[PDB]
Amino acid sequence: TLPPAWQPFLKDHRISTFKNWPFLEGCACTPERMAEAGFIHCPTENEPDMAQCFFCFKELEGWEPDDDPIEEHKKHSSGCAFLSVKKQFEELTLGEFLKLDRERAKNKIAKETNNKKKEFEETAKKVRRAIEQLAA
Amino acid sequence: LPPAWQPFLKDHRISTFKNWPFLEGCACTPERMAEAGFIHCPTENEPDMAQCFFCFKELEGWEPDDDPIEEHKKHSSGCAFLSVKKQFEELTLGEFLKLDRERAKNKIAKETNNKKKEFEETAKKVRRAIEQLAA
Ligand SMILES: [Zn+2]
Ligand SMILES: [Zn+2]
């Protein structure tokens, strides 16, 4: 077993998050194929095909049986470092690895910022709207 | 980096030498004694006691001139650590996992041995006491 906050780094871990995933045998975007691509299942009650790259925290919905999780990812997140990582886990130098666990945590933080933002703008729109209704 | 893999790190091994009656001037310095896997596990009757983080051998009676690597090789020859030539960070995740797998083995080995000694001790106290009854 490895320290919990590092499992995501481990494919079989990822695979294991897809529970009740629907695109299975025959589909191009099976849990397995999602996993080699970096996704983890984050099903919302209102978003049950919700999945994100454990590294570059991008989320994605709208999965069709024909969807290649890889080229999808390079489309919507071209600058994910994971994607340039061509070595299995154990084949990496703790150096190489500790460096990536560094982008991840940085990337993570940059996503919680562009999220606090998006939640600020949202609240502004409602303050604005509300003012206009009180000016008529 | 978690809290069970730290031992694996020189800096953390040094971080463990609290007192350590031996410093500048000595050859048995905290740096050289952590560069051989030691961690300071001081006590009342053992304020200078060290230990391998890997093999677990415990060693007392240190003197300024004592070369920790040597004391280590000549008190534990079967310690994968001593053969580890690469810097932590230049280790493969795989290799690193193999060492950790061996480390936990030795820890088992060591507590098993303890349980034997503890069991035999009791065996003697019990035998003796019973013998005395047949008299
Ligand atoms: Zn990604
Ligand atoms: Zn050792």
Contact status of B94 with chain A (Cβ, < 8 Å): yes
CB-CB contact of A43 with A5 (8 Å) = no
Which residue in B89, B94, B97 is closest to A98 by CB distance? B89
Here the tokens at position A86 are: 């061509």
Quick check: B94 and A90 CB within 8 A? Answer: yes
DSSP of B123-134, one letter per residue? HHHHHHHHHTT-
Residues around the ion ligand 1 (C-beta < 5 A):
A 38, 53, 55-56, 77, 80, 82
Contact status of A3 with chain B (Cβ, < 8 Å): yes
Overall domain count for chain B: 1
Question: Which CB contacts under 8 angstroms, 24+ apart, belong to B116-124?
Answer: none
Which residue in B1, B5, B93 is closest to A92 by CB distance? B93
Here the tokens at position B87 are: 């810097």
Determine which helix (DSSP H) or strand (DSSP E) holds A7, and give its type and residue range. Answer: none
Quick check: B92 and A93 CB within 8 A? Answer: yes
CATH of the domain at B28: 1.10.1170.10
Classify residue A10 as exposed, middle or buried by CB count within 10 Å of its CB (0-12, 13-18, 19+).
middle
For chain A, list the strands marked E by DSSP: 39-41, 51-53, 59-60
Q: Which residues contact B52 (CB under 8 A, 6 or more apart)?
A: B36, B37, B38, B39, B72, B76, B79, B81
CB-CB contact of B5 with B21 (8 Å) = no
CB-CB contact of B92 with A90 (8 Å) = yes
Q: What strand order describes the sheet that includes A59-60?
A: A39-41, A51-53, A59-60
CB-CB contact of A54 with A39 (8 Å) = yes
Contact status of A114 with chain B (Cβ, < 8 Å): no
Give the three-class secondary structure for B63: coil
Q: Tell me which residue range forms the domain holding B33.
A: 1-135
Please name the method used to determine this structure.
X-ray
Contact status of B88 with chain A (Cβ, < 8 Å): yes
Contact status of A1 with chain B (Cβ, < 8 Å): no
Q: Which residues of B touch A94 (CB under 8 A)?
A: 88-93, 96
Please give the Cα distance from A75 to A68 (Å, whole number): 11
Please give the Cα distance from B83 to B77 (Å, whole number): 10
Task: Give the number of whichever ligand sits closest to the CA of residue B102.
Answer: 2
